[PDB]
C-alpha cells in the first residue's frame, strides 16, 4: 500500500487564478465565499494513484488516428510534447497526462456544443499517455481553432488544449490549459486573465519547437509542466 513519506510545497494561490474572477462570469456563482480551511499534510493528501498498469490503446496519444472514420482529420498537424517536473526540477516519471480539445474550427465533440463550425468526421479530440522514465510525454494532434463562448458579447477563447496531470499525489493533481505562442487572443481572454500575474500566464504558452518537427509532415509545440515540489519529511513529531 501507499506510504506517507513526503511533503509537498504549499501552493501559491496568488500564482494560480483566484476562485472569484468576475470577468469570467460563471466563476461568480461557483466560487466559495468562505476562506479555505488549511489542514496539515497526512497520508490522505500525500499519496495518490499510480497508473503504470492502466491499459492504453495503441493510438491513445495520437489524435490523428484515434478517431479514424476513413480519413485523416483536417487541420494543422502538430506534435505537442514536453517534460513534467516538480518545483525542485525533479522529473515526474510514469505519470498520467490526459488532454482534450476542439477540432481545427473550434468545434467540440460534445452534444452541448452547438457552435456552427462543423465537426470533423475523423477527429475526436481526446488523448492520454504516461510520461516516460525521464518525465517526457508526447501527443500528436490537430492545432485546435479558437472558439466563441457566451461570456461577454464577443468573447473568443484562444486556441487551447486542456491538460490533466496526476503526479505523485492527490496534492499534486492539476488541470490547466495550454495556449499557443503568439496567439493575439491570449491577452484578451477573461479565462487567461483569471491568472493575475502575467509571468504565470506565460507559463501556459506552448512554444513552437522546430527542432521536434517532422519535415514535410508536422510541426511541434513544447509545453513543460511543473508540479508542486516534493521533499522528504524532516524533524516531525519531535
Amino acid at each position: 500500500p501507499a506510504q506517507d513519506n513526503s511533503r509537498f510545497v504549499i501552493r501559491d494561490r496568488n500564482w494560480h487564478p483566484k476562485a472569484l474572477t468576475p470577468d469570467y462570469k460563471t466563476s461568480i456563482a461557483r466560487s466559495p465565499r468562505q476562506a479555505l480551511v488549511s489542514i496539515p499534510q497526512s497520508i490522505s493528501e500525500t499519496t495518490g494513484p499510480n497508473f503504470s498498469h492502466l491499459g492504453f490503446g495503441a493510438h491513445d496519444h495520437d489524435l490523428l488516428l484515434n478517431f479514424n472514420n476513413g480519413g485523416l482529420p483536417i487541420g494543422e498537424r502538430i506534435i505537442v510534447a514536453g517534460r513534467v517536473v516538480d518545483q525542485y526540477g525533479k522529473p515526474v516519471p510514469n505519470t498520467l497526462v490526459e488532454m482534450w480539445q476542439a477540432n481545427a474550427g473550434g468545434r467540440y465533440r460534445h452534444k452541448n456544443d452547438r457552435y456552427l463550425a462543423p465537426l470533423d468526421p475523423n477527429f475526436g479530440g481526446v488523448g492520454r499517455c504516461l510520461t516516460d522514465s525521464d518525465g517526457y510525454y508526447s501527443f500528436r494532434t490537430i492545432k485546435p481553432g479558437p472558439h466563441p463562448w457566451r461570456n461577454g458579447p464577443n468573447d473568443w477563447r484562444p486556441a487551447h488544449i486542456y491538460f490533466g496531470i496526476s503526479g505523485p499525489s492527490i496534492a499534486t493533481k492539476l488541470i490547466t490549459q495550454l495556449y499557443f505562442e503568439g496567439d493575439p487572443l491570449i491577452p484578451m481572454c477573461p479565462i487567461v486573465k483569471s491568472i493575475a500575474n502575467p509571468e504565470a500566464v506565460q507559463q501556459l504558452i506552448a512554444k513552437l519547437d522546430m527542432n521536434n518537427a517532422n519535415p514535410m509532415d508536422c510541426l511541434a509545440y513544447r509545453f513543460d509542466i511543473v508540479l508542486r515540489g516534493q521533499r522528504k519529511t524532516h524533524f516531525e513529531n519531535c
Partner: protein, 200 residues
C-alpha cells in the same frame, strides 16, 4: 528568500471536461480501459456502499457539468495506489454530474480509519476534488459518515474547522437506495450551507 520553479497555474476544466475525463458520461465512445466510478468489485472486503450527491452553485441551482475525483482508504485503512481494473478494490475513482444525470454516484466500500501524521486517528473519510466550468482551481473537500459520530467528534481534521456548524457540511447522510446502504453527500459551492473546502 529561496524561490523554486513556480507551479504551472490551474485553469478551469471547462464545460467539456467529460470528453477528456468522463467519456461515457459525455455520451461518447469509450476506450478499452476507463477510470470510472466503481472502486469496489463485489468481492472486495468491507461494507459495500453507494455514494451519491448533487452539486449546487451560489444561487442554489444544480451544477450539471461537474467532474469529481475521489481518493479513499480500503476497508482496512490502507491506501491502494497500484491502479488496475483487475483489482477487487481501487482507492481512486471518478464521477460526474451531467445534463441527463444531475446526481453523481460512486460504488465503493466504507473506508477504514487512517492516522494523521502525528499518529492521531482521523474519522473515516473520502477525499474529493471538484472541477467544473466556473471553477478556476479545483475545490478539495472530505466526505465523512453520519453513523461515525463518535469518530467524527474526535477527528483532528474536522476539529480544525473553527465552527461546529460548518463541520456539519462534511457529514454524509445514511439512507437506503434500491435496498442497499447509501450515503448522500451534497456540495454547496457558495452561500447558505457552503461546504467546507480545504487547502493543503
Amino acid at each position: 528568500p529561496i524561490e523554486l520553479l513556480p507551479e504551472t497555474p490551474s485553469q478551469t476544466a471547462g464545460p467539456y471536461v467529460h470528453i477528456g475525463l468522463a467519456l461515457e458520461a459525455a455520451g461518447n465512445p469509450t476506450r478499452d480501459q476507463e477510470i470510472w466510478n466503481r472502486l469496489a468489485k463485489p468481492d472486495a472486503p468491507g461494507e459495500h456502499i453507494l455514494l451519491l450527491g448533487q452539486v449546487y452553485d451560489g444561487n442554489g441551482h444544480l451544477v450539471r457539468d461537474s467532474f469529481l475525483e475521489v481518493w479513499q482508504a480500503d476497508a482496512n485503512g490502507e491506501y491502494q495506489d497500484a491502479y488496475n481494473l483487475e483489482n477487487a478494490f481501487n482507492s481512486f475513482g471518478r464521477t460526474a454530474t451531467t445534463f441527463d444525470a444531475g446526481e453523481w454516484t460512486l460504488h465503493t466500500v466504507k473506508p477504514g480509519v487512517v492516522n494523521n501524521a502525528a499518529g492521531v486517528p482521523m474519522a473515516p473519510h473520502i477525499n474529493i476534488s471538484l472541477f467544473a466550468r466556473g471553477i478556476n482551481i479545483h475545490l478539495h473537500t472530505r466526505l465523512y459518515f453520519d453513523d461515525e459520530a463518535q469518530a467524527n467528534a474526535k477527528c483532528p481534521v474536522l476539529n480544525l474547522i473553527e465552527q461546529p456548524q460548518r463541520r456539519e457540511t462534511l457529514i454524509a447522510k445514511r439512507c437506503e437506495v434500491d435496498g442497499k446502504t447509501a450515503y448522500r453527500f451534497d456540495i454547496r459551492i457558495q452561500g447558505e450551507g457552503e461546504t467546507v473546502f480545504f487547502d493543503f
